[PDB]
Amino acid sequence: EEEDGEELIGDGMERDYRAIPELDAYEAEGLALDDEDVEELTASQREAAERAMRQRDREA
Amino acid sequence: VPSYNAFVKESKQKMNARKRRAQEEAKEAEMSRKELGLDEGVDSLKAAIQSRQKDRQKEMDNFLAQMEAKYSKSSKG
Amino acid sequence: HRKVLRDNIQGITKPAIRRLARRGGVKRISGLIYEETRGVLKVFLENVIRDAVTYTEHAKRKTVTAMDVVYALKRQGRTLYGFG
Amino acid sequence: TELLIRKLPFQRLVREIAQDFKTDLRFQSAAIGALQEASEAYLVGLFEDTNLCAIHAKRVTIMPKDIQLARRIRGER
Numbered sequence: 001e002e003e004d005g006e007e008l009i010g011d012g013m014e015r016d017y018r019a020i021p022e023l024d025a026y027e028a029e030g031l032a033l034d035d036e037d038v039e040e041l042t043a044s045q046r047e048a049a050e051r052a053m054r055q056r057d058r059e060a
Numbered sequence: 061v062p063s064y065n066a067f068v069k070e071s072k073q074k075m076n077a078r079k080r081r082a083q084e085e086a087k088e089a090e091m092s093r094k095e096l097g098l099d100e101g102v103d104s105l106k107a108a109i110q111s112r113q114k115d116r117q118k119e120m121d122n123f124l125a126q127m128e129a130k131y132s133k134s135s136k137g
Numbered sequence: 138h139r140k141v142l143r144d145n146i147q148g149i150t151k152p153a154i155r156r157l158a159r160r161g162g163v164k165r166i167s168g169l170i171y172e173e174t175r176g177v178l179k180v181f182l183e184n185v186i187r188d189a190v191t192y193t194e195h196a197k198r199k200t201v202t203a204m205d206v207v208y209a210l211k212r213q214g215r216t217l218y219g220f221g
Numbered sequence: 222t223e224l225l226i227r228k229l230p231f232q233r234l235v236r237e238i239a240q241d242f243k244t245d246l247r248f249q250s251a252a253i254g255a256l257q258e259a260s261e262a263y264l265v266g267l268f269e270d271t272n273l274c275a276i277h278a279k280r281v282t283i284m285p286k287d288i289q290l291a292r293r294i295r296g297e298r
Contacts (some may be wrong), residue, residue, distance in 0.1 A: 002078055005085070005165030005282025008155055016152040023227035030236045032200040032247040040133045040204050041196045049195035050212065053188060057216075086279035092164065093276045105277045109270045109294050113218065116266050120214065120259070124207055127255060131203040142237035148230025156225045157261065158283070161268025163275075165282040173285035177267070177292075178260060182238050185256070188243045200247035203240070206255045218296035 146175050184217075185209050225261045230251075267291060 032038060039047070091102070098108055129135045150169045156168055188209040193201045232253055239246055268283075270291035275283045292298065 002074070002081075004081060005167065005280075007165055008159050008163060009212065010295070016155055019224075020227060022178055023229040024224075026228050026232050026250055027251060030232070030248055031253075032202075032249050034297060037203045038200055038249065039196065039198070040202070041192060041208070044193045045197075046192070046208065049191050051214070052195075053191055072268055082279075087162070088281045089279045096273075096276070098273065098276075099264055102277065105273055106294055109273060109291065112269065113295055114256045115145075117214070117253065120210070120262065123262075124211060126253075127203060127207050129256065131207070131251060137224070140276060141242060142233060145230065145234040146236045148234050150230070153226045153230075157264050158266045158268050159295055160223070160225060160261075162237075163268055163272050163283050167282055167284040169258065169285055170288075173251065173288050178264060179238070179289065181260060181263060182235065182256070184257070186235065186238050189252070189256075190239055190246070192226075193246070198247065201252050202249045203251035203255055204231060206252045209261055210255070217294070220296040221292065221298055 146179055149175050149178060185213050188212055225265070226257065228257070231257050231260075266296075270295060 098104055151171055154171050155166070157174070158170075186204075186209075189205045190202050192205040192208050193199070196202075196205070232248075235253060236246075236248070239248075256267055265276070267288065270289045271283050274287040274290045275281065278287065280287075
C-alpha cells in the first residue's frame with residue numbers, strides 16, 4: 001500500500017482531452033423545450049420557499 | 061513462502077520506500093511552494109486560501125449578475 | 138412509468154477528476170482521491186438541487202428554470218462557508 | 222469553453238439527484254449549464270486549496286486528508 005502519487009502531466013495526457021460527441025452535448029430527455037410554464041418566481045413564492053427551507057434546515 | 065521473516069523483509073522494504081518517496085515529495089513540494097509564491101508556515105496558507113475565497117466570492121457574484129442580466133424578468137422588462 | 142436513474146456518479150470519470158485537478162494546479166493525486174471528489178460533488182449537488190427544486194415547486198411549475206438555480210446558488214453562498 | 226466534465230454525464234447525474242426530490246421534472250438547459258459552471262468553479266477552487274494544503278505538508282500528491290483540511294479552512298462541513 002501507499003503507492004506512488006499518480007502523475008497528472010505525464011505522457012498521453014492529451015488522451016484526457018479527446019472529444020467525445022456522445023457526451024459533449026446535452027441530450028433531449030429531461031429538458032424543457034416547451035418554453036412556457038417557466039414563469040419566474042414571484043416575491044411571495046420566493047419568500048415562502050426560502051422560509052420553508054430555513055424551517056427545514058432548522059429541523060436538521 | 062508467506063513466512064514471518066518474508067513479511068519482515070517486505071515491511072522493511074515498504075517502510076524504506078515510503079521514506080524515499082516522502083523525501084522526494086518534500087523536495088518537489090518545496091520546489092512547487094516557491095514556484096507558487098506562498099510564504100512558509102500555516103497562517104500564510106490560511107491567508108492565501110481565504111483571499112482566494114474572497115476572490116471566488118466576487119467572481120460568482122459577477123457570474124450571478126450576468127445570469128440575472130440575461131434571464132431575469134427585471135432585465136428583460 | 139417508473140423510470141429511475143442510478144449510478145451516474147460514475148459519469149464523473151477518472152479523466153474528469155484529472156482535468157479538474159489539473160485546472161486546480163494539482164501535479165499528482167492519491168488513489169482514493171476519485172471517491173472523495175465524487176462524494177464532495179454529490180453532496181454539493183444534492184444541497185443545491187434540493188433548493189432549486191423547492192423554488193420550482195413554489196413556482197407551481199414542474200421545470201427548473203435558470204432563475205431557480207440562480208436563487209439556489211445565492212442562498213447556498215450564505216450557508217456553504219458559514220463554518221458549519 | 223474548456224473541458225472539465227462532459228455535459229451528458231453531468232446532466233444524467235443532475236436528473237438522478239433531482240428525481241429523489243420530485244418525481245417528474247424538466248430542466249432548462251441554461252439551468253443545467255449554470256449548475257455545471259458553478260460545480261466546476263467550486264471544484265477547481267477546492268482543488269487549488271487542497272494543493273496548497275498538500276504542499277504545506279511537504280507533498281505534491283493530494284489526499285482526501287488535504288481535501289478535508291482545505292474544506293475546514295474554507296468554512297465548510
